[PDB]
Amino acid sequence: APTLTARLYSLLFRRTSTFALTIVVGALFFERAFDQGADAIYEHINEGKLWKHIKHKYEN
Amino acid sequence: TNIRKSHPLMKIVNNAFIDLPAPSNISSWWNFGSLLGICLILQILTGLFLAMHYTSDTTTAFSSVTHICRDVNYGWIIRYMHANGASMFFICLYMHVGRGLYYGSYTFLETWNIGVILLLTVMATAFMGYVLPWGQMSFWGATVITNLLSAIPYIGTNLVEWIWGGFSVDKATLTRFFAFHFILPFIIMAIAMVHLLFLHETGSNNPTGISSDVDKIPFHPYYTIKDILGALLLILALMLLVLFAPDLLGDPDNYTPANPLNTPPHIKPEWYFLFAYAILRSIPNKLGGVLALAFSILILALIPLLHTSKQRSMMFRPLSQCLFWALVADLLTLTWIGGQPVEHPYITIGQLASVLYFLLILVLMPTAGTIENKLLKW
Amino acid sequence: ALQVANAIIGHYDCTYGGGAHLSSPLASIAATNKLCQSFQTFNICYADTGLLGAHFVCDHMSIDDMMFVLQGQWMRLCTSATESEVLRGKNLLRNALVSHLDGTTPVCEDIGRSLLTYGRRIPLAEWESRIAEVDARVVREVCSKYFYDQCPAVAGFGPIEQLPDYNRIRSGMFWLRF
Amino acid sequence: AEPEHDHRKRMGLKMLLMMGLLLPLVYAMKRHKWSVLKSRKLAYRPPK
Amino acid sequence: VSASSRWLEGIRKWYYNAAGFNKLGLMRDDTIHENDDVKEAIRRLPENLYDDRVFRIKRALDLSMRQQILPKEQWTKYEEDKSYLEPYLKEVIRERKEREEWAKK
Amino acid sequence: GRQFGHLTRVRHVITYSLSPFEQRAFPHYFSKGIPNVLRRTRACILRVAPPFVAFYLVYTWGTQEFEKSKRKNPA
Amino acid sequence: MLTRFLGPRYRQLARNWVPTASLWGAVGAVGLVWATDWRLILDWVPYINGKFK
Amino acid sequence: MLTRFLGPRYRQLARNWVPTASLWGAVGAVGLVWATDWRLILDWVPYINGKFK
Ligand code: HEC
Ligand code: HEC
Ligand SMILES: C/C=C(C)/C=C/C=C/[C@H](OC)[C@@H](C)[C@@H](OC)[C@@H](C)CCc1oc2c(O)c(OC)cc(OC)c2c(=O)c1C
Ligand SMILES: COC1=C(OC)C(=O)C(C/C=C(\C)CCC=C(C)C)=C(C)C1=O
């Protein structure tokens, strides 16, 4: 009853509509956080290299 | 009284996908049936979105395919999903046939015989598809495979020129090959339904080859969820290929435009034709070589007549297990030879492997089944 | 409130007069479509636990339909119970309680049992007060608490090939629409 | 030859990371349902 | 009384163990392919042999799903393997072949 | 055309099952899982592996023999 | 003509299903907004910002 | 192995169906010859002559 999976179930999972709402709201914030991360990993593993890092050489 | 159970359309869905009694029992080797369906609709969907931009004229066909890969927003994933899905379609086909061979599933005569038609239809479809981008492999692929008909005595030449549109592969050949390649997957889809209709009559076989009515489970949720997992593995296997190695399973020679004056030095089939290719060229005779090719796939229809064993499955049959694996490894041998030039060691070992293919199915596996019967005092 | 809800679903057997017209949707559908021989709802009480549900007796080709309709009623009462049927259940319980406490023996049992379980005798006017409080909102609250998305205990005996798999009985304990 | 080169490798890393979430998750989903069968116990109780 | 018949029996026992239906607690006749002759022989079986057969097959299909096997102590010993279906099957084959002899005339 | 309630006849068999929410999806996943795969491997290696090594030997020899044949020496 | 479905029970039945039908609309609105990247609404959402500045 | 179908009754049954199977071949031969305009055979046929002289 202190436990967090319990309160997750009680507030959000018990009803299928709330379950669906928590998935769609969940999917919005996942798409941001994953694309933020996975781009930043890909960009860091290719340190210069891409036209995003070349950009500043040719002017405004 | 259930809406799921009595509605004339949902009836069909429920009796196939939900309430269908299935063995408690069936392993990962039973995942390939749904995977073939996934493959079928993947190829339909990508193939549709490729058809939206492809032109079937000789002057422009290569240009349209590369227009897809460079200019069309995400045309590259669609094109190589399609290309590697066709190879995925073949991996799943071969697994699915082999499962059927091992587990004695061919004793479902109609299901199996329709399956043999499905193999031949998907082979003919994928031949046509490879002709479409009008690379070098496209042209000579179209030349050789159409010319197989020229081995039919008296009328074979007339037939080849009938499907060509003239004396050579030409403008007429490519436009009809686009049309034939468009419709045939939908014909396949219809035959896949008849395949399923004959199957539901008996329900599934299982690893033991023993009747499983004593222990059926509902298709949902068990095989709905096992199928989802299996499809997610199919997506991994496909998306590994398109995103990390798009051209691993194809030919570089199909990136040079078609050229009727020069056949390339190295020419081999698409990997999934290599065994049958190896069989045909092991025979230094025109009529015999093509008769062996036809027989290399049409043999599957004789396998039910050659089942000697008092058991259905190979699970409790060690002699047959050994000879099954000799068949797989021999098939792996034939795809290796198919990949190599017609020179010294390769000619003989490919001839011996061809002989072994036909000897294993015709003679050696039926005899193994009799010996196994005699050993169990049966 | 659970007893009110159980009264709404009620009981049935094949010797009940007028089947089609019975108020309980389960009892009505079971009578018309020959879904069972009998069913009964129950609420067996022990110290700090119990068994709340139903039992039925049916032909081999009817278990699936019976289970479907039973579960739908539980689900319906959790989500969408209405004022009028709750009155009917309330009335059925006043009539059951009063008709039960009729004779020296059932009253003596009730004195004896109640002093073991409640430590008092709960007088008839108290039960009526407790019954009267129950409305549709209470039935929806109290049924949801015990029924909705809970794991049932299931017992099957006889020709039970068509007894639904447990996962599919578990799935009958919630509704995707709600 | 291949202007898509950098885009396909970006989607590839996303594919691998997504699959590293989804493959164990769908596995758990499938195992959770197959629980009822995989732990089931049989007894045979014939008469006399 | 033969060294050679003991040898054939020892190849047979070897094969029996290799076949490994006994590992799932199956008898030989549990593993037979159900054709029309066999389905009838099963139909002809008395109550006890019928009910034993279904449980053995149940137990095997259960194990085959878990991809597991019985403790070695509980494997069916080759010497203890009851040929319970065979006499019924011989009779069903014998009756069919009589019909087929009559269909010839 | 086959339905539950019409499949076959079974008598005298009790099945005990537990809810998915009562039990673990990965009960003793490595402790029992690894011993099993090894047991399954041992069971089948002699049936599956020897044709593929037989492929491997003919592969290794065939590639080697083809390589050596397109070299000369005394001519 | 639809007068079958007008009375105290159907009034209660509609009232019961109202929080659910409201939440299914709330599901579908966000799902449309998410699927299309609906620029009009997502500019408000304090962390979901693909457009700079 | 096909020995089920060998005996005096099946010998009589084959003999009965022989004029019919012969006539169904005669149907199919002419039908193939007609459909293709099989030049080899139709040159013999004394009035069916699309080729002059
Ligand atoms: C030459 C044999 C053959 C080919 C090729 C084949 N099938 Fe089958 N298929 C079978 C047999 C036999 C079964 C029954 C397997 C069993 O019950 O063990 C079957 C079963 C299946 C199943 C359901 C059970 C299972 O095994 O997963 C599906 C679905 C399926 N086939 C669809 C397809 C599709 C789609 C294709 C490709 C167009 C196809 N099959 C190609 C013979 C084959
Ligand atoms: C709606 C039409 C359509 C359908 C359906 C279709 N395709 Fe294609 N396919 C195309 C077109 C157009 C191309 C040419 C573009 C290209 O080469 O990728 C093509 C290309 C191909 C290629 C050559 C791949 C390459 O580029 O090297 C193969 C192989 C193939 N298809 C096989 C299949 C198979 C197998 C199926 C499913 C039975 C199928 N296709 C479904 C239209 C279709
Ligand atoms: C309108 C008429 C139609 C559609 C006729 C269709 C006939 C289809 C066949 O049967 C379905 C066929 C595809 C099937 O044969 C059984 C294959 C396995 C044949 C394998 C095959 O591939 C080759 C190939 O791919 C090549 O290019 C790279 C070139 C080739 O020579 C050098 C071959 C080749 O020599 C063979 C045998
Ligand atoms: C009794 O065995 C069966 C399975 O168990 C292994 C399946 O998994 C599937 C699922 C197959 C699918 C999704 C392909 C559908 C094909 C078309 C052309 C729409 C079917 C039908 C089946 O019958």
Short mmCIF file of C-alpha atoms in Angstrom, two decimals, chain B residues 19-22 200-203 211 213-214 216-219 315 317-318 321-322 325-326 328-329 332-333 336 340-341 343-346 349, chain F residues 1-4 6-10 43-44 46-56 58-67 69-70:
data_model
loop_
_atom_site.label_atom_id
_atom_site.label_comp_id
_atom_site.label_asym_id
_atom_site.label_seq_id
_atom_site.Cartn_x
_atom_site.Cartn_y
_atom_site.Cartn_z
CA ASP B 19 -11.19 -20.10 -30.26
CA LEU B 20 -9.30 -22.42 -32.62
CA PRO B 21 -8.14 -25.52 -30.65
CA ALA B 22 -4.37 -25.74 -31.08
CA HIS B 200 -8.44 -26.08 -40.04
CA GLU B 201 -10.20 -29.30 -41.09
CA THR B 202 -7.59 -31.24 -39.03
CA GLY B 203 -5.97 -28.58 -36.88
CA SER B 211 -2.79 -36.68 -31.84
CA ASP B 213 -7.01 -33.57 -28.85
CA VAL B 214 -6.36 -34.80 -25.35
CA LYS B 216 -5.73 -28.54 -26.87
CA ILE B 217 -5.39 -24.91 -25.80
CA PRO B 218 -7.19 -21.84 -27.29
CA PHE B 219 -5.18 -20.00 -29.98
CA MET B 315 11.19 -37.10 -33.06
CA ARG B 317 13.32 -41.86 -35.30
CA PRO B 318 17.17 -41.40 -34.92
CA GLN B 321 16.98 -37.64 -37.93
CA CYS B 322 20.50 -38.33 -39.27
CA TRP B 325 20.26 -33.50 -41.49
CA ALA B 326 22.22 -35.05 -44.36
CA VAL B 328 19.75 -30.06 -45.03
CA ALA B 329 23.61 -30.16 -45.20
CA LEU B 332 23.60 -26.26 -47.94
CA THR B 333 26.28 -27.96 -50.11
CA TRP B 336 27.63 -23.35 -51.97
CA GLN B 340 31.01 -21.32 -57.49
CA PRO B 341 32.20 -21.46 -61.20
CA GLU B 343 35.45 -25.81 -62.77
CA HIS B 344 37.36 -28.92 -61.53
CA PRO B 345 36.43 -29.99 -57.90
CA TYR B 346 33.06 -28.20 -58.03
CA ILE B 349 30.99 -32.71 -55.92
CA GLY F 1 -14.31 -27.26 -38.08
CA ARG F 2 -13.14 -28.61 -34.66
CA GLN F 3 -14.49 -27.07 -31.39
CA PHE F 4 -13.85 -27.43 -27.66
CA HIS F 6 -16.36 -31.91 -29.41
CA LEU F 7 -12.66 -32.91 -29.69
CA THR F 8 -12.19 -36.24 -27.84
CA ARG F 9 -13.10 -38.29 -24.70
CA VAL F 10 -10.99 -37.92 -21.51
CA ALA F 43 20.36 -35.45 -26.93
CA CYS F 44 20.59 -34.17 -30.53
CA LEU F 46 25.04 -36.79 -32.87
CA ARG F 47 22.00 -36.45 -35.16
CA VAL F 48 22.41 -32.78 -36.23
CA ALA F 49 26.22 -32.02 -36.25
CA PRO F 50 27.95 -34.88 -38.32
CA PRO F 51 26.33 -33.93 -41.74
CA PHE F 52 27.43 -30.27 -41.20
CA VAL F 53 31.05 -31.18 -40.35
CA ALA F 54 30.79 -33.44 -43.44
CA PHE F 55 29.73 -30.25 -45.33
CA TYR F 56 32.61 -28.35 -43.62
CA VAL F 58 34.08 -31.00 -48.33
CA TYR F 59 33.94 -27.13 -48.22
CA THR F 60 37.49 -26.75 -46.85
CA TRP F 61 38.94 -29.41 -49.22
CA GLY F 62 36.99 -28.12 -52.27
CA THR F 63 38.06 -24.46 -51.90
CA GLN F 64 41.70 -25.61 -51.29
CA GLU F 65 41.70 -28.00 -54.29
CA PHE F 66 40.23 -25.35 -56.65
CA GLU F 67 42.87 -22.78 -55.46
CA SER F 69 44.56 -26.36 -59.44
CA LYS F 70 44.82 -22.87 -61.02
#
